[PDB]
Amino acid sequence: DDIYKAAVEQLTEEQKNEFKAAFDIFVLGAEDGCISTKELGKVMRMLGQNPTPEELQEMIDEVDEDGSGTVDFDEFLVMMVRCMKDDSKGKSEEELSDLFRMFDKNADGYIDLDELKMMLQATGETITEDDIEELMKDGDKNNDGRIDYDEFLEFMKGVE
Amino acid sequence: ISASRKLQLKTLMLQIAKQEMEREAEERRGEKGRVLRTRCQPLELDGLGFEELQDLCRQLHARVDKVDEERYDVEAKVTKNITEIADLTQKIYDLRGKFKRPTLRRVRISADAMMQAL
Amino acid sequence: GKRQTEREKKKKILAERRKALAIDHLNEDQLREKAKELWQSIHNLEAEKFDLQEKFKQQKYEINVLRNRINDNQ
Amino acid sequence: TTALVCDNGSGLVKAGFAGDDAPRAVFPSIVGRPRHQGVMVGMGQKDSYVGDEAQSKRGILTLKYPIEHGIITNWDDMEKIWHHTFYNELRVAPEEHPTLLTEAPLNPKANREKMTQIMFETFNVPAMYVAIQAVLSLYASGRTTGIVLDSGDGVTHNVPIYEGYALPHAIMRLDLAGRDLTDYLMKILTERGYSFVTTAEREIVRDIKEKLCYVALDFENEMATAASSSSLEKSYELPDGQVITIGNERFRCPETLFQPSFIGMESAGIHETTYNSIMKCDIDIRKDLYANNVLSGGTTMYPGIADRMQKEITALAPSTMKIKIIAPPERKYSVWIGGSILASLSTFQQMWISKQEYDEAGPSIVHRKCF
Amino acid sequence: TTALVCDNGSGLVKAGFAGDDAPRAVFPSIVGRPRHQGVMVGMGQKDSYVGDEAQSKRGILTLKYPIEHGIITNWDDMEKIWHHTFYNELRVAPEEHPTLLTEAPLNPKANREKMTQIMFETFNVPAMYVAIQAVLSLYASGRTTGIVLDSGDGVTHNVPIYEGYALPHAIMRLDLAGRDLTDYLMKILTERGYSFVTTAEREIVRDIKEKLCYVALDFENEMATAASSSSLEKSYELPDGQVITIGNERFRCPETLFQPSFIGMESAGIHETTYNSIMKCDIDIRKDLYANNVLSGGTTMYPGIADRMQKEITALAPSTMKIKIIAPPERKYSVWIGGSILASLSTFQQMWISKQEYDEAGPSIVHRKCF
Ligand SMILES: Nc1ncnc2c1ncn2[C@@H]1O[C@H](COP(=O)(O)OP(=O)(O)O)[C@@H](O)[C@H]1O
Ligand SMILES: Nc1ncnc2c1ncn2[C@@H]1O[C@H](COP(=O)(O)OP(=O)(O)O)[C@@H](O)[C@H]1O
Ligand SMILES: [Mg+2]
Ligand SMILES: [Mg+2]
């Protein structure tokens, strides 16, 4: 949400000038000012770096929650810097180990469906039936019916 | 197949785990204080004879010896565990390096720059 | 080789660990004060011993975790 | 606390906590150093893979068992095996657990004394006790009499026991066992064209022996049948393809047990050393020993041995006595189950060799009252 | 500082700084003196054009490769090539950069020793290391096992590796490679009327081979089809016009790889020396080598070779094993990518042959522990 607004607030006019110079081609005229997201596929490729198309679609559909099909210069800026790395250091390796030890409060060294299921239920979050299985795939990477240290580490990799 | 909600759930579970770890640490501290108070009994010795002074002092010295013995034992155990932890951490790091270092490189660093030099 | 080496090591550690023990030959007030001081010393020693117990437990669990991780390579 | 019932054996180390039904971790006892050079850097290559890890990398190792015939010939490797067993397969530090090793009868003293010295100095256990491998197998059957034939992989020994009183003058220990059968099978396979030489391929021949060989009820009739029909030829797929067909090698490999002249050994088979062990006993307990003959150990798992042995003994024994051969389905782990039962007893709790006792009398304490 | 990952090769010198994806400068390794007289004065005519400059003035030069079959036959020209590579294609003085050369297996010692002596005396590098050209190609695939067939332009060698332990007794080096295919193509083109003789026209025949030739899935069917229809005849325009039409010479040139009897060589094709190299390995790692067969080197870029080779090996191998042929799209630079990865490792940073070590033991240091 507006968290990434705060994240992009750090970049001042110094990157805004470059972003406007790049975006000027998008506003090529003969339009009503809607400014869609059509060119964004190559606009994000203006410097060469380009993420997966699925992430690009997620960014496109996520922004402009009003559904106007309009890419605000604020939204364009935050999505273009989103191509650059942006993370809050992802906790700490010892901190992550402590978090997993709390996760493996059963002291089994593995997390099944029930473990993380109860863990998230304690949070009280509404979780769909279409979920859980998605979380099962996210966690049980080896498809061994449990969550191991490596699977947890990649699951929680640099998330903050 | 939602994506942003996955990040939301990740952050929420991270915060919940942090809170649980904090409360568990507080519980550990409280229980440790309770046990320390229970095991180390408080003694009052106002208005006593010097013979009782000698007896209590000798008992305290014996308790000091026993506690130092326990501390020596658990210290040796902890040092050995630390050595094993360091060894296993080194081994797992070596395995991870063997698995991943061949997959890290400088991709497209200068090949794309070769436009019309020739 | 832990038959006389470790025993002598721990015996020396115990011997050097013991400090001066000459008290009861003094006046009552300061002797009581120092007895309370040594009670508090034993209190701190027991607290540290409990902390070491908990640390040893956690490190044992982490050892089990590392053993699981190295076993999972195959 | 709980006791560790380890059982060194020779070929498979079986261990687990006292009071359970089956050993927790069972893995071959082999230590194999790599033999080639190795060119990949940083691959994390160790200097010795022990236990079940060296049965997966056996293609580039030189596996070598540290226990030849009951006795231990390479003490450093045996120490490595024990260290692995304690720390990685059970993950329990030995500083807080009594141990109950097992030893074959009539073994050299120095082996047992070195075993106890290692357990007390290196691993620093609280208390350890060494027991004869046949008494445990008699425990597991729930009997209290009977003559037990414990044909392991290293050595076959035959200890008769009556009413709890072992008869030390009637123990017949024979050194033919599973390993010699593996070598003989590997030697007779060459008659069809299959040559196994490397110490790694001995494991493949062992797998062939386990999965295909069986003991013939009557040897000459089987030799005649296999030479006319082809109903016996069973095929087996090597670890790379090229299936092989075993003909009358199937029942000729385990026949060596009843005719040790095949591998050049002089002594009589396991069918006649049991009868000799019985006849050395007193005249009044022979009926009970006849009726309670017990089989144990891995090598007695061949399909059809409990009938061949009974037929042979019935041929030898007087016609009036009843010959019965106890062959429980849990034969392989019989010794370890008996060890667990013995370690779980309350009456046995004061027989351990406590560490202070060892400090006062040295390693020679094991031969003393604490046997 | 950064390391220089040079890779002499034979036909194309590939070089670049360690840690990138592709070599910085790739250029043919030919040194050609002019052969005519020269009448213009002051034109600035040099005495030897090396590298890619002599592929543009090749009309009046006599190009001659300084590396025949892996080995180096003309040391002065090779020194000239190295000097060009360092100073003009990378523009980094060698006084401040470690170097990582590559060498084919089973090459003469004197070649390697002279190479290290040159690198330490003439160019005066801080430290250099020589690596076998197949281990790098195995690095680049991200594997740790597998048998790699590195069919370069000079020599084709087939090094099997398991779990990082190379098997020195199973290396099968064969001297048929891209150059012999170029000569054979130049020899069979004469059957239509096109005669290429000059050492400059060998480059034109090489271009024809690269752009048109392909490996047939089944040889006899293609020979029958090309002799009836005309759907295969592809034309090509020489550097001056006069287009030529290649008929069944298209798949007959690279067929020499699988039937070296075409150019009179006795040995078996690259489809059967791989199977022989596998069969020399131990019986327990043959499945892994079957499943991880790796292709590398330039000459393995023919369209349709990864299917012909798989069909041939599947014909030879037992029916149960799965045969898989790894053919990454970046085949040509696979060795150099692997070299970059190896030079970028931290564990490898202490294996370089430091100059003080060379000063103490002479050029024969390369055969010692620092391999
Ligand atoms: N199912 C089986 N069929 C035939 N032989 C077997 C079978 N299982 C094990 N063996 C043989 O028994 C040996 C294992 O014997 P074991 O009882 O483990 O010896 P130990 O007394 O040293 O533990 C193996 O080497 C194998 O040759
Ligand atoms: N695209 C291609 N198709 C067919 N053959 C090729 C192709 N590219 C290169 N070759 C052959 O491979 C040779 C280059 O091999 P290379 O891997 O550079 O050898 P080296 O191992 O010496 O570097 C050339 O001589 C050419 O004959
Ligand atoms: Mg046994
Ligand atoms: Mg090459």
Side-chain angles (χ1 to χ4, degrees):
Chain A
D1 49 317
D2 202 77
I3 52 180
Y4 306 102
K5 151 75 183 304
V8 75
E9 266 283 355
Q10 60 176 178
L11 285 321
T12 58
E13 303 283 324
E14 39 90 36
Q15 293 311 299
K16 172 175 169 187
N17 165 82
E18 327 172 15
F19 279 21
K20 181 161 187 178
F23 117 100
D24 202 3
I25 194 266
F26 209 147
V27 280
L28 31 68
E31 295 295 334
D32 66 331
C34 175
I35 312 175
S36 173
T37 157
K38 307 177 181 180
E39 290 196 19
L40 283 191
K42 298 181 180 180
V43 166
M44 279 48 188
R45 206 242 152 271
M46 189 271 303
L47 294 181
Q49 199 284 326
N50 175 256
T52 74
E54 301 77 4
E55 294 161 346
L56 300 169
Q57 177 188 183
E58 165 61 36
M59 294 182 187
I60 289 174
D61 292 58
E62 170 189 5
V63 306
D64 192 72
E65 297 77 358
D66 53 328
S68 60
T70 66
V71 185
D72 188 1
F73 197 91
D74 330 357
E75 289 193 356
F76 143 78
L77 217 166
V78 68
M79 289 302 104
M80 191 63 181
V81 304
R82 214 81 244 274
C83 303
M84 314 305 301
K85 186 213 63 55
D86 37 7
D87 48 354
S88 303
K89 305 172 186 57
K91 280 76 183 58
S92 307
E93 300 180 356
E94 296 305 323
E95 177 179 7
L96 292 179
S97 63
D98 308 329
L99 292 184
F100 201 21
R101 177 262 298 102
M102 196 55 59
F103 294 152
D104 196 75
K105 61 181 183 182
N106 53 344
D108 304 336
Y110 312 92
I111 282 187
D112 76 323
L113 193 273
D114 307 328
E115 279 282 328
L116 193 64
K117 172 187 55 53
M118 298 303 302
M119 284 299 183
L120 269 306
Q121 286 163 168
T123 77
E125 159 67 282
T126 299
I127 174 162
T128 68
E129 67 290 347
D130 303 2
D131 204 359
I132 307 167
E133 178 55 46
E134 300 172 9
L135 293 182
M136 176 187 307
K137 175 188 175 303
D138 301 332
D140 191 13
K141 206 57 60 189
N142 188 264
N143 304 330
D144 202 10
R146 86 292 154 267
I147 297 179
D148 202 66
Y149 160 81
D150 59 330
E151 296 181 339
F152 145 86
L153 171 61
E154 185 181 12
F155 185 86
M156 311 290 190
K157 189 54 186 176
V159 187
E160 187 171 1
Chain B
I1 311 297
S2 180
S4 311
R5 283 310 313 266
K6 178 57 185 300
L7 280 68
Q8 302 185 199
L9 301 192
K10 199 81 67 64
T11 58
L12 268 46
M13 191 56 210
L14 269 32
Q15 301 143 186
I16 292 297
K18 173 183 183 180
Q19 301 153 190
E20 177 177 10
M21 173 54 185
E22 294 157 339
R23 72 166 189 262
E24 222 284 280
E26 173 170 4
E27 156 202 359
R28 261 125 46 185
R29 298 183 292 98
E31 215 291 324
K32 158 196 50 54
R34 142 197 160 79
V35 163
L36 179 68
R37 297 170 54 183
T38 305
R39 213 66 172 187
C40 271
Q41 63 288 145
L43 295 323
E44 193 262 25
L45 24 67
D46 191 8
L48 299 193
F50 298 84
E51 305 180 357
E52 178 68 293
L53 135 85
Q54 302 134 201
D55 284 63
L56 258 39
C57 102
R58 191 269 310 178
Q59 162 200 0
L60 139 79
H61 311 335
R63 295 168 74 99
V64 166
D65 152 71
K66 176 179 182 57
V67 172
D68 294 358
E69 169 187 5
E70 309 314 311
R71 127 209 175 177
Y72 177 89
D73 145 75
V74 66
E75 171 186 4
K77 299 170 55 186
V78 168
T79 52
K80 208 58 190 60
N81 203 129
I82 289 305
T83 306
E84 307 314 312
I85 285 285
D87 168 66
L88 282 182
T89 304
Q90 167 196 7
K91 301 303 297 305
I92 297 299
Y93 157 76
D94 302 333
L95 297 174
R96 206 104 323 278
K98 182 175 71 175
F99 294 159
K100 230 160 305 306
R101 298 198 61 179
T103 63
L104 58 88
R105 51 185 295 182
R106 316 213 320 273
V107 288
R108 291 81 191 268
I109 168 68
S110 177
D112 325 57
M114 315 305 301
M115 308 178 51
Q116 292 186 182
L118 177 56
Chain C
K2 302 203 57 182
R3 52 145 296 180
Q4 46 207 356
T5 300
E6 262 47 39
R7 173 167 301 181
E8 176 48 48
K9 159 195 53 51
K10 57 184 50 60
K11 180 180 309 176
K12 154 191 174 181
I13 295 308
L14 173 62
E16 57 83 17
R17 181 52 265 274
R18 170 81 291 272
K19 312 180 305 176
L21 222 41
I23 36 185
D24 321 86
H25 56 355
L26 307 181
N27 188 32
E28 13 74 8
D29 36 349
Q30 329 88 185
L31 290 186
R32 169 175 308 170
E33 192 61 29
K34 193 159 294 182
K36 297 190 296 286
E37 296 157 10
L38 301 188
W39 186 101
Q40 295 295 341
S41 72
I42 265 304
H43 207 76
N44 105 93
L45 288 178
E46 184 181 84
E48 182 178 5
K49 132 207 157 303
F50 184 88
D51 309 333
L52 295 177
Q53 298 158 181
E54 315 317 306
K55 293 304 175 63
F56 154 76
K57 157 259 308 175
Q58 300 143 7
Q59 298 341 99
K60 176 180 182 61
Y61 186 78
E62 184 45 48
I63 271 302
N64 110 87
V65 171
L66 294 173
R67 141 258 187 270
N68 165 232
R69 291 154 58 167
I70 193 178
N71 112 96
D72 294 328
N73 291 90
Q74 62 285 349
Chain D
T1 167
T2 43
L4 290 177
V5 180
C6 183
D7 170 75
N8 299 315
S10 170
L12 278 83
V13 169
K14 295 158 289 179
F17 300 103
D20 326 344
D21 301 331
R24 188 174 307 278
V26 173
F27 61 95
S29 85
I30 51 192
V31 182
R33 294 87 160 81
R35 76 185 189 196
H36 290 118
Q37 293 177 335
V39 295
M40 292 295 183
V41 70
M43 293 301 293
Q45 304 141 346
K46 299 192 299 176
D47 296 334
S48 68
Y49 309 81
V50 318
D52 215 336
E53 184 176 7
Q55 277 284 109
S56 170
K57 298 186 173 185
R58 76 184 176 218
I60 43 92
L61 303 169
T62 155
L63 320 175
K64 296 182 180 180
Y65 294 72
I67 293 194
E68 278 296 322
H69 294 151
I71 87 183
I72 307 182
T73 62
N74 190 3
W75 275 110
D76 177 60
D77 293 356
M78 187 88 272
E79 175 170 351
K80 198 181 312 301
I81 283 296
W82 275 334
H83 166 83
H84 171 85
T85 306
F86 289 162
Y87 288 79
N88 303 20
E89 289 289 349
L90 302 187
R91 285 85 69 191
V92 283
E95 300 280 4
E96 305 181 354
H97 281 285
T99 321
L100 177 69
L101 293 324
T102 62
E103 180 78 3
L106 299 191
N107 261 9
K109 316 293 276 300
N111 160 41
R112 168 182 301 181
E113 300 169 355
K114 280 285 304 180
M115 173 184 305
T116 204
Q117 163 183 327
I118 288 301
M119 292 302 294
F120 269 154
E121 287 193 359
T122 293
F123 298 89
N124 216 318
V125 293
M128 52 87 61
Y129 183 66
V130 178
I132 305 307
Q133 284 199 0
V135 179
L136 283 324
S137 59
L138 196 48
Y139 269 114
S141 297
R143 315 268 176 189
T144 179
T145 82
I147 159 184
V148 25
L149 171 119
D150 180 87
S151 172
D153 176 32
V155 56
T156 287
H157 57 263
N158 178 301
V159 173
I161 288 186
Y162 179 88
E163 216 63 35
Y165 289 105
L167 275 30
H169 64 264
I171 300 179
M172 306 290 299
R173 165 177 172 180
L174 176 57
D175 290 328
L176 207 169
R179 190 97 57 81
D180 296 19
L181 299 194
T182 294
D183 290 354
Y184 183 54
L185 172 64
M186 175 193 304
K187 176 158 189 157
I188 58 174
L189 282 194
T190 201
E191 290 174 358
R192 314 187 72 97
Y194 320 122
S195 77
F196 302 105
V197 281
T198 324
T199 174
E201 288 168 335
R202 166 115 44 85
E203 317 299 329
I204 300 178
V205 177
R206 183 180 59 85
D207 188 7
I208 294 176
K209 169 180 70 90
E210 289 184 351
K211 296 181 182 295
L212 264 55
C213 295
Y214 76 96
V215 170
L217 173 60
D218 189 8
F219 187 68
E220 285 300 334
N221 299 339
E222 291 288 353
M223 284 297 298
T225 289
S228 80
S229 134
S230 297
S231 56
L232 297 193
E233 294 203 1
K234 195 77 67 57
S235 68
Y236 172 88
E237 162 181 333
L238 258 45
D240 83 310
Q242 48 184 345
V243 302
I244 75 178
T245 60
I246 304 305
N248 61 359
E249 280 85 37
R250 240 152 133 258
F251 55 89
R252 257 210 298 174
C253 160
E255 185 66 16
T256 304
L257 291 176
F258 304 107
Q259 306 181 19
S261 74
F262 277 179
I263 57 180
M265 251 194 167
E266 167 123 23
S267 67
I270 73 176
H271 76 79
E272 192 166 5
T273 195
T274 283
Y275 174 63
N276 283 349
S277 164
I278 285 174
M279 294 295 291
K280 281 183 175 184
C281 306
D282 309 304
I283 196 183
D284 343 35
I285 67 181
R286 289 178 200 178
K287 178 195 290 293
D288 306 345
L289 268 44
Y290 277 140
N292 292 9
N293 183 3
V294 182
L295 295 188
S296 140
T299 328
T300 51
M301 286 275 299
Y302 289 141
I305 185 174
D307 309 359
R308 172 68 176 280
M309 199 171 179
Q310 168 174 4
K311 160 181 176 294
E312 295 289 358
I313 295 185
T314 305
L316 298 175
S319 306
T320 305
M321 301 296 104
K322 183 178 179 180
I323 309 298
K324 179 69 68 64
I325 292 193
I326 280 80
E330 331 116 355
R331 246 170 306 188
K332 304 194 56 178
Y333 315 109
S334 189
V335 168
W336 188 86
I337 297 178
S340 159
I341 285 183
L342 171 59
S344 173
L345 282 191
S346 52
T347 314
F348 173 64
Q349 224 58 43
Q350 65 282 9
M351 298 300 291
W352 305 87
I353 306 173
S354 178
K355 195 180 183 312
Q356 52 180 349
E357 320 186 16
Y358 163 67
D359 300 321
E360 294 289 342
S364 169
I365 184 63
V366 206
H367 314 329
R368 291 171 63 90
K369 66 310 286 75
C370 27
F371 177 74
Chain E
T1 167
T2 43
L4 290 177
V5 180
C6 183
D7 169 75
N8 299 315
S10 170
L12 278 83
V13 169
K14 295 158 289 179
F17 300 103
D20 326 344
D21 63 352
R24 188 173 306 278
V26 173
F27 61 95
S29 84
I30 51 192
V31 182
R33 294 87 160 81
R35 76 185 189 196
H36 290 117
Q37 293 177 335
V39 295
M40 292 295 183
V41 70
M43 293 301 293
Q45 304 141 346
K46 299 192 299 176
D47 295 335
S48 68
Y49 310 81
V50 318
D52 215 336
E53 184 176 8
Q55 277 284 109
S56 170
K57 298 186 173 185
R58 76 184 176 218
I60 43 92
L61 303 169
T62 155
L63 320 175
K64 296 182 180 180
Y65 294 72
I67 294 194
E68 278 296 322
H69 294 151
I71 87 183
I72 307 181
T73 62
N74 190 3
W75 276 111
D76 177 60
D77 293 356
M78 187 88 272
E79 175 170 351
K80 198 181 312 302
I81 283 296
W82 275 333
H83 166 83
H84 171 85
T85 305
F86 289 162
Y87 287 79
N88 303 20
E89 289 288 349
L90 302 187
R91 309 187 190 88
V92 283
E95 300 280 4
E96 305 181 354
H97 281 285
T99 321
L100 177 69
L101 293 324
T102 62
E103 180 78 3
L106 299 191
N107 261 9
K109 316 292 275 300
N111 161 41
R112 168 182 301 181
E113 300 169 355
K114 280 285 304 179
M115 173 184 305
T116 204
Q117 163 182 327
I118 288 301
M119 292 302 294
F120 270 154
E121 287 193 359
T122 293
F123 298 89
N124 216 318
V125 293
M128 52 87 61
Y129 183 66
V130 178
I132 305 307
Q133 284 199 0
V135 179
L136 283 324
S137 59
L138 196 48
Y139 269 114
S141 297
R143 315 268 176 189
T144 179
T145 82
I147 159 184
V148 24
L149 172 119
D150 180 87
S151 172
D153 176 32
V155 56
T156 287
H157 58 263
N158 178 302
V159 173
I161 288 186
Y162 180 87
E163 216 63 35
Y165 289 105
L167 275 30
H169 64 264
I171 300 179
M172 306 290 298
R173 164 176 172 180
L174 176 56
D175 290 328
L176 207 169
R179 190 97 57 81
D180 295 20
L181 299 194
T182 294
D183 289 354
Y184 183 55
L185 172 64
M186 174 193 304
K187 176 158 189 157
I188 58 174
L189 282 194
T190 201
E191 290 174 359
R192 314 187 72 97
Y194 320 122
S195 77
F196 302 105
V197 281
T198 324
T199 175
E201 288 168 335
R202 166 115 45 84
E203 318 299 329
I204 300 178
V205 177
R206 183 180 59 85
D207 188 7
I208 293 176
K209 169 180 70 89
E210 289 184 351
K211 296 181 182 295
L212 264 55
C213 295
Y214 76 96
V215 170
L217 173 60
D218 189 8
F219 187 68
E220 285 300 334
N221 299 339
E222 291 288 353
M223 284 296 298
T225 289
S228 80
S229 134
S230 297
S231 56
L232 297 193
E233 294 203 1
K234 195 77 67 57
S235 69
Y236 172 88
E237 162 181 333
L238 258 45
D240 83 309
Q242 48 185 345
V243 302
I244 75 178
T245 60
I246 304 305
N248 61 359
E249 280 85 37
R250 240 152 133 258
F251 55 89
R252 256 210 298 174
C253 160
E255 184 66 16
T256 304
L257 291 176
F258 304 107
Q259 306 181 19
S261 74
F262 277 179
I263 57 180
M265 251 194 167
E266 167 123 23
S267 67
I270 74 175
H271 76 80
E272 192 166 5
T273 196
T274 283
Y275 174 62
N276 283 350
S277 164
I278 285 174
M279 294 295 291
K280 281 184 175 184
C281 306
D282 309 304
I283 196 183
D284 343 35
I285 67 181
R286 289 178 200 178
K287 177 195 291 293
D288 306 345
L289 268 44
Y290 277 140
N292 292 9
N293 183 3
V294 182
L295 295 188
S296 140
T299 329
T300 52
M301 287 275 299
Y302 289 141
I305 185 174
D307 309 359
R308 172 68 176 280
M309 199 171 179
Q310 168 174 4
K311 160 181 176 294
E312 295 289 358
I313 295 185
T314 304
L316 298 175
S319 306
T320 305
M321 301 296 104
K322 183 178 179 180
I323 309 298
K324 179 69 68 64
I325 292 193
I326 280 80
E330 331 116 355
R331 246 170 306 188
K332 304 194 56 178
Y333 315 109
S334 189
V335 168
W336 188 86
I337 297 178
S340 160
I341 285 183
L342 171 59
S344 173
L345 282 191
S346 52
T347 314
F348 173 64
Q349 224 57 43
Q350 65 282 9
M351 298 300 291
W352 305 87
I353 305 173
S354 178
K355 195 180 183 312
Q356 52 180 349
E357 320 186 16
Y358 163 67
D359 300 321
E360 294 289 342
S364 169
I365 184 63
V366 206
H367 314 329
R368 291 171 63 89
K369 66 310 286 75
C370 27
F371 178 74

